């Protein structure tokens, strides 16, 4: 009951939510790797 009370006051669900948020942030960063390549590609195809 005390462990359930401590988890409820703090909020496995929070760790999964933090992992999902980290995965979403990582997915945005990988798209930035494509885009910074593409913005460099935009420089290259222009020049």
């Amino acid at each position: 009951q005390i462990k359930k009370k401590t988890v409820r006051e703090r909020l496995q669900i929070k760790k999964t939510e933090l992992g999902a948020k980290a995965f979403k942030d990582i997915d945005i960063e990988d798209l930035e790797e494509l885009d910074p390549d593409f913005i460099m590609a935009k420089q290259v195809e222009q020049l």
Binding site: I39, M40, K42, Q43, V44, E45, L47
Partner: protein, 107 residues
Amino acid sequence: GALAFVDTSDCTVMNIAEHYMASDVEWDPTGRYVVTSVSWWSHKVDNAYWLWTFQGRLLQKNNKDRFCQLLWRPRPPTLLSQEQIKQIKKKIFEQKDRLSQSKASKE
């Protein structure tokens, strides 16, 4: 000095080039350089010349004392046509220019 590049389709704020000495910003008549440079009698000696390229690559490194400006000496009326821009509206044919530069940069 706080620089930023505003690109098109889509509109973004993507980059910041750092300039501590620069006072004025003007671009080239080709489309090749937009330069942010320094003036002697309007601010202190912090001097640099840092022009802004689009890709984040460095466009200038120079410090020559009491410099006031650097801007494009202009070119003629071009009298261009839409057919030459249509060929640039086609890596596909623009493959040779990087490889010829690679032979010139060999040691």
